[PDB]
Design a protein around this ligand. Structure first.
Ligand code: HEM
Ligand SMILES: Nc1cccc(N)n1
Length: 291
């Protein structure tokens, strides 16, 4: 199955920077969301979940088709809570009806990371909306009550290696888990709407205790009020993952560079870019634009 990137008719860098700006401005405006965490975190999760349905074996799923807009995927139990991100992007899509859903969902994630002071994430346009019959079935996203072995195997389907997996998980420093959405409760750190390498520092420096939350699920909690999912904790349980966790905890720049590459790769999995397609766009933040 092949998905060839097709640039929205006549659009260029400037058009997409305008969409980015609209998203960034709304992020700044609607600051009260989720007890003032803002929509940054949920937008990053949305971009990851619409991309995380991909299967390298047959190229089903993936961000290309923007299938999250269809009820089967929209209602995936694994996507509980993402409706908030979708609603946030609705007015954006209304103003820029020309951008495809896949491009909008993925751009939302890139915009969020950058506006939260994270690394620059090159982004490519061209995803094209596909029929409702192309929507992937539920169950392709990962479980959180598993171990390192599960995590490693799961991500091989997304063509991600150990380093890429550990780097991507760093996004768990963002936002929080919500009991009503996933059966887990609590943030991973203190700075939950600013993109940093705090995820790794906390895994290594906090004293975690295996407890049961009000949904009767086990999770690791610290006195500081932070939490880690069993899958997050597996990163310091597995010796190979542990080495990488230590690396990122001690090199903020390295983490930023590796996360950027892995996140762009995640958002582009399944897409074939023509040799003459535009080069990846690197959008300026509102701050860099003096906006
Ligand atoms: C091992 C794979 C993964 C597991 C099992 C997992 C599990 C979870 C769970 C259970 C939540 C809480 C949802 C809620 O209650 O609202 C969550 C939130 C989150 N996830 Fe992951 N996740 C994984 C991978 C990733 C990756 C690769 C990224 C992005 C690079 C990511 C980004 C996020 C973000 C930003 C949030 C917070 C969302 C919010 O605050 O609304 N996760 N994840
Ligand atoms: N904020 C957050 C989201 C998912 C997992 C963790 N540990 N923390």
């Amino acid at each position: 199955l092949v998905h060839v990137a097709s640039v929205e008719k006549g659009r260029s860098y400037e058009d997409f920077q305008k969409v980015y700006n609209a998203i960034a401005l709304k992020l700044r405006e609607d600051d009260e969301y989720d007890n003032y965490i803002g929509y940054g975190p949920v937008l990053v999760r949305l971009a990851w979940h619409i991309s995380g349905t991909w299967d390298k074996h047959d190229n089903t799923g993936g961000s290309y088709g923007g299938t999250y807009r269809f009820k089967k995927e929209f209602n995936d139990p694994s996507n509980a809570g993402l409706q908030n991100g979708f609603k946030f992007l609705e007015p954006i899509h209304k103003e820029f009806p020309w951008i495809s859903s896949g491009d909008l969902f993925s751009l939302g994630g890139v915009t969020a990371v950058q506006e939260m002071q994270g690394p620059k994430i090159p982004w490519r346009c061209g995803r094209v909306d596909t029929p409702e019959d192309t929507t992937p079935d539920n169950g392709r996203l990962p479980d959180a009550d598993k171990d390192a072995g599960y995590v490693r195997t799961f991500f091989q389907r997304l063509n991600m290696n150990d380093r890429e997996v550990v780097a991507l998980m760093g996004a768990h420093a963002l936002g929080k888990t919500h009991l009503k959405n996933s059966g887990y409760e609590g943030p991973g750190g203190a700075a939950n709407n600013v993109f940093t390498n705090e995820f790794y520092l906390n895994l290594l420096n906090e004293d975690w205790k295996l407890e049961k939350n009000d949904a009767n699920n086990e999770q690791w909690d610290s006195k500081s009020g932070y939490m880690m999912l069993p899958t997050d904790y597996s990163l310091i349980q597995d010796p190979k993952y542990l080495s990488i966790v230590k690396e990122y905890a001690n090199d903020q720049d390295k983490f930023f560079k590796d996360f950027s590459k892995a996140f762009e790769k995640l958002l582009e999995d399944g897409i074939t870019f023509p040799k003459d397609a535009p080069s990846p766009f690197i959008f300026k933040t509102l701050e860099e634009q003096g906006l």
